[PDB]
Amino acid sequence: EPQVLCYLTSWSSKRPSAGRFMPENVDPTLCTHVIYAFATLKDHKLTEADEKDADMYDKVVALREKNPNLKILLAIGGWAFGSTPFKELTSNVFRMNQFVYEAIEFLRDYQFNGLDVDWLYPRGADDRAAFVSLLKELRLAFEGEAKTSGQPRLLLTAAVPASFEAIAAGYDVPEISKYLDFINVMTYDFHGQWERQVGHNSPLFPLESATSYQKKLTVDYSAREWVRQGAPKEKLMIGMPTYGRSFTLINDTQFDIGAPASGGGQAGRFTNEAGFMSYYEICEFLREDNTTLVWDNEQMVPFAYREDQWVGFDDERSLKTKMAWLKEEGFGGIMVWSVDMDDFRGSCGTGKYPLITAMKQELSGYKVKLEYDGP
Ligand SMILES: *[C@@H]1O[C@H](CO)[C@@H](O)[C@H](O)[C@H]1NC(C)=O
């Protein structure tokens, strides 16, 4: 019963040349769920973010025609979106409920299998309560619709932060765990171009020399914080990045964890964002001349540097290491950000979709089983 939820980013279709990704590029057998990101709120109603999206919806659905057990979800929100439309969505009950009732129709019309809520992020007591009510209402209406109609219930999932501080700030974990089908923990973006020291995007474990605060910025500590706060393991989907985060070094001779950095490193040719690289862009950086590939034995993740360019990322080995940690802890499955940034063309020299394949094969035979695991 382990689940693999893969995000598909709409804007990946705007990629140039090989980087261009369409719903048809998705292997219908890789993931258990596909989540399309993002839809938006216009007049407090679940709505297309762009007319080009309507047909995109039609194409991400009907991946079901090559795999009928594949579930397709639509995500609302995201970072660009902001926290304000969610505050106004949950300000009064009518708009809230009318949002739910019409969202159900919207989803059923497109024949989605459910909804992913990406409010990034609720903050403060009033936001906490409103996030719970939104989730509660969606869940009860999904159940209620499943009985007043005829078909199996729409799925409810949400993307949630890894930061232990953001958890306390915005998430009543026992309550949201009642109504969510899956809790997608964003166990990445622990470090990046907003910092002036080199650090890894998604380290599994911390360095022994790390401060007590730095030790909390890991996949292992974050996932366990969610458990500690009451999230049920079988609903916890641990996030796996198919991308890396890069730095421009102050000094070429200092390339170790914590070396000074002036900002993000040179953008990739396809994602066009400094401080950021997709995995197939990582490989291009890796086969350049004189690039040093390093394996961090403590953090159990790779990184690489060449001249003043430094990038920390995830490969086959780190993701396999993570699946072993996953099974050991007994989590319900994984979430992948994102399917369009795996090497979906096989240009790395390994197989097509190498990162997700490596995770899938390592989860083979795994079945989630709940058991007491101490304080
Ligand atoms: C780079 O680092 C070394 C010591 O690690 C320092 O002596 C050197 O001056 C630095 N380079 C520059 C241009 O400052």
Author numbering: 528 to 902
Passage from the reporting paper:
To study the substrate-binding mode, the structures of two complexes of GH18B were crystallized and obtained: that of wild-type GH18B complexed with (GlcNAc)3 and that of the GH18B-E647L mutant with a bound (GlcNAc)5.
